[PDB]
Amino acid sequence: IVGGTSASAGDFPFIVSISRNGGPWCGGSLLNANTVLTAAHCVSGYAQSGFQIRAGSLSRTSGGITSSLSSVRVHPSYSGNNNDLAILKLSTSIPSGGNIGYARLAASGSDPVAGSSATVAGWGATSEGGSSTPVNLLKVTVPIVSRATCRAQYGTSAITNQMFCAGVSSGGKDSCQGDSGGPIVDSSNTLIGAVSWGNGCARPNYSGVYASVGALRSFIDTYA
C-alpha cells in the first residue's frame, strides 16, 4: 500500500495474508471457514503446495491461525488482467470470532459508483519496486474512478465490465506489488473487489484496477 496508514486490530477481520515458499506474496479475503477469495494471478499456474494463508493477525509473519490449501479454482474466463478471481479451499478450517470474521460480498449485478469512497488493505510495498515489505497491515482510502475515465487512461478494451478502478488523479494513494488479491471494501464495509493490476502504483492518471466481486459473484457463489 502506497500512501496509507497502519491498520488497527480488528480492522478488516476477514483479511488473510498469503505467503508463497515462505515469503510474502499476496492477500485474500476469508469468505467462510474453509474458503478464501484472492486474485487469480496470485495462484494460477503455480504449485499449490507453496501457499500458506494466515488469518486473525496484523502481521503476515506471525500470530493468528494458518492453513495450507486443499484446492484452487480460478474463474473459468480468467486471462491475464481479466476475470481475475480465484477461490482457495483451506486444508484447516478457520472459525470466526475474536479478530477473525467473514466477508460480506457485493451483490450480483452491482458496480461501484464513481466518486464513492473505498478502502483497500494489504502487506505490499510502499513504493513501486520496494526493497522491503511491511510486516504489519496497511490500509488506504481512495475514491472509485468511473470506468469511462479508467478507459481513457488505459484503453477502451483494457478495462472490462469485470473490472473497476480507484485512485486519486494526482496519484499518491494506491495498492502495490504484494497487495494483489487483497480486499477493497465500500463505505458500508462490503467487499467490492480484489487488488488486481495497474500501470505502476499510485501514478497520476493511472488508477488502480480491481476485480469486481459484483460482476463475478456467480462464480464466487458456486464454489464458496
Q: Please state the domain extents for the chain.
A: 1-12+103-214, 13-102+215-224
**Count of helices and strands (H, E) across the chain:** 3, 14
Cell numbers placing 118: 473505498
Active site residue 75: no
Could you tell me the fold of the domain covering 13-102+215-224? Thrombin, subunit H (2.40.10)
Q: Which long-range contacts (CB under 8 A, 24 or more apart) does 47-53 make?
A: 48/72, 50/20, 50/21, 51/18, 51/19, 51/20, 51/25, 51/88, 52/18, 52/19, 52/22, 53/16, 53/17, 53/18, 53/28, 53/88, 53/90
Annotated active-site residue in 17, 84, 175, 207: 84
Could you tell me the fold of the domain covering 1-12+103-214? Thrombin, subunit H (2.40.10)
Active site residue 41: yes
**Rounded CA separation 27/39 (Å):** 8
Which resolution, in Å, applies to this structure?
A: 0.8
10 Å Cβ neighbour count for 83?
22
Experimental method: X-ray
Annotated active-site residue in 17, 19, 29, 41: 41
Amino acid at 172: G
**Rounded CA separation 183/7 (Å):** 13
Q: Please give the torsion angle defined by the CA atoms of residues 90, 75, 195 and 190, in that order, rounded to the nearest 10 degrees.
A: -80
Annotated active-site residue in 29, 67, 180, 212: 180
Active site residue 180: yes
Which residue numbers in the chain precede an interruption (C–N > 2.5 Å)? none
| Residue 193 CB partners (closer than 8 Å, separation 6+) | 106, 112, 164, 183, 184, 210, 211, 212, 213
The alpha carbon of residue 167 and the mean position of all alpha carbons in its chain are separated, in whole angstroms, by 15
Cβ contact 188:112 at 8 Å: no
- Asked whether this chain's domains 1-12+103-214 and 13-102+215-224 adopt the same fold, the reply is yes
**Rounded CA separation 187/133 (Å):** 27
